[PDB]
Amino acid sequence: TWHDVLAEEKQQPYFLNTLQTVASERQSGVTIYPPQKDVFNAFRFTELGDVKVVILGQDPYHGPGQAHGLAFSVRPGIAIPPSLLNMYKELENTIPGFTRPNHGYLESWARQGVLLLNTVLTVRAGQAHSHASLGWETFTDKVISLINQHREGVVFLLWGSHAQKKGAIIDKQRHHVLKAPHPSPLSAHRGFFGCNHFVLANQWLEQRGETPIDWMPVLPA
Amino acid sequence: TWHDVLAEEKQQPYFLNTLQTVASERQSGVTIYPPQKDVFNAFRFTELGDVKVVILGQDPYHGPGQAHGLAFSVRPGIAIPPSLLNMYKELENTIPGFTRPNHGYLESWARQGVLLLNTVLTVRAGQAHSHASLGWETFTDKVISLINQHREGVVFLLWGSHAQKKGAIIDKQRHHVLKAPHPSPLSAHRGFFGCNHFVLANQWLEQRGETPIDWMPVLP
Amino acid sequence: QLVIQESILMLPEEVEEVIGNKPESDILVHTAYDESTDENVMLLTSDAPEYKPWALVIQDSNGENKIKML
Amino acid sequence: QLVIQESILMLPEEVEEVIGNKPESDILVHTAYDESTDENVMLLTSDAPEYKPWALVIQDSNGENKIKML
């Protein structure tokens, strides 16, 4: 249970190196993003066995104080990013329970079994997709396989040709795999906003009797 | 072992609920078939490491006293079902070593490494394919996968577009995968009886030095 | 009476290949064998939980088929 | 000034589907949102480490795109 896809992967050279090459860059002078304290939050807020839904994201936010370990989620005061803002549009429209929060902190979803995984875990301040050759993908690829191996009935919310498809060949009848275009404004319209991923993803849980997910953010301390 | 991940699967909620949902139904008033005592016989009579051949079947016989856990196999006195009867004709003709017994009890094949797996493990008396929404498929799917994962050189005897194809994407390199129409009378003639699955299966098993299989039934 | 001994699930194509007409969904081949006349009585019905009759096929000792749509 | 809030990587096909022109490699959709005019300013560049400008697309409150090739 993360002492599975971790016990030996975390000893394997590829991931062993990805860590230090990041560490050096840090002390070497470059400010790398998700503070080494936050790098592994995804696995913290949601355990292997609790993974009810899985949302794939690319690499962390490269601006100051935005990223904190969870994909899409920003800190309690940062401006809601275009895609998270859009995910909200879909929500306030699809789930009639709702209304929108006032921030982009999604830790609430996190502790409700929604795994918010980035395929690349770190980024250089100001340089998008800069750490995309260290080994975060091969580790993150491991993670998905394991979820696909040791788990049943997980919903994979795959957005964008990059996350869906390409980095997501899951057992279609061991897990639910919903696909759709990226929430990004250069894409959300003309083809995304019509999907009902959030409602569907809850619809199939009650179906299995599993307790559904509350997509209404919140804001702890 | 079968204590090979079946250990994990068996705790997975889906395989916990498929059990109880079947349990309730039982004590709730409905007579579900393969008495619990028999439900898993296929894994008992043939172990993972012994699986020389694999024959896929659908769901158990929904009539009284027919099924006992093995696919196609009936108990020591029940009428030989049409499909098993046909399987016999192919055999009676293909393998010049045997004749035909006078029963459909196939445990003999079972203890010789022939895995007779139904994709769905239970059924309601008189209601065919009634339990096909509980979760036996997904469990059974795991099972084939594992045989394909931890095993090498297994013959998969797949009959009928449902068993072959549909529920059967095995690495056709590491394993032998013969296909053919279902022995059902509404099909056996229309292009099945010509295949030589039993002889070929032994042909392979033999080409690897492995001890072949005796397709001639027998009583315990 | 008419004891059905087995019920095999087939797909539209397998059945069309035999019947000459294509079933709009999965078919259940319900077979009742006849020791004596050496006949196989088959009742093709839709899949569970309807079992709505689709076709009736009578087959003799040497495989000739006497089909009739229901 | 112009604060880019996110940078999404897309493939030639996904961008062709919107732009009407096909980028010759991965594209990075750099987005800066404007609370007020309710506009999304998007800078499409090549992938790291060049960030060679490809196109500029302005989108309004109801999704109309004002594209411009760089």
Catalytic site residue from B59, B141, B171, B214: B59
Instruction: Please name which of D17, D8, D1 lies closest in space to residue D44, comparing C-alpha atoms.
Output: D8
> Is residue D32 classed as helix, strand or coil in its secondary structure?
strand
Contacts with B35 (C-beta within 8 Å, 6 or more apart), sequence order: none
Sign of the alpha-carbon torsion through A140, A141, A144, A145: negative
Domains by residue range for chain B, with CATH: 1-220 (3.40.470.10)
Q: What is the CB-side half-sphere exposure of residue B127 using CA atoms within 13 A?
A: 14
Query: CA torsion A45→A51→A55→A56, rounded to 10°?
Result: 80
Does the annotation count A50 as an active-site position?
no
> Is residue D55 classed as helix, strand or coil in its secondary structure?
strand
- Residues of A in Cβ contact (< 8 Å) with B4: none
**Tokens read off for B27:** 């004590």
| Cα–Cα distance, A133 to D53 (Å, whole number) | 22
> Which chain B residues in 184-213 lie under 8 Å from chain C, judged by CB atoms?
184-187, 189-190
Cβ atoms of A137 and A167 closer than 8 Å? yes
Give the resolution to one decimal, in Å. 3.2
Are there at least 3 beta-carbon pairs closer than 8 Å between B and A?
A: yes
- In the sheet that holds C65-69, the strands lie side by side as C6-10, C27-34, C39-46, C53-59, C65-69
Distance, in angstroms, between C24 CA and closest chain B CA? Answer: 16
Q: What is the CA radius of gyration of chain C?
A: 12
| Cα–Cα distance, B220 to B9 (Å, whole number) | 32
- Residues of A in Cβ contact (< 8 Å) with B141: 173-174
Cβ atoms of A201 and A208 closer than 8 Å? no
| Cα–Cα distance, A135 to A127 (Å, whole number) | 17
Cβ atoms of B145 and B139 closer than 8 Å? no
Contacts with D24 (C-beta within 8 Å, 6 or more apart), sequence order: D12
**Tokens read off for A5:** 């896809």
Domains by residue range for chain D, with CATH: 1-70 (3.10.450.20)
What 8-state DSSP symbol labels residue A130? T
For this PDB entry, the determination method is: X-ray
Contacts with B166 (C-beta within 8 Å, 6 or more apart), sequence order: C11
Catalytic site residue from A59, A141, A171, A214: A59
- Residues of A in Cβ contact (< 8 Å) with D29: 184, 186-187
- Contacts of D among chains (3+ CB pairs under 8 A): A
The region that residue B170 occupies, defined by phi over 0 for left and psi between -120 and 50 for alpha, beta otherwise, is: beta
Backbone angles phi, psi at D69, to 5 degrees: -85, 135
| Count of positions (residues) in chain D | 70
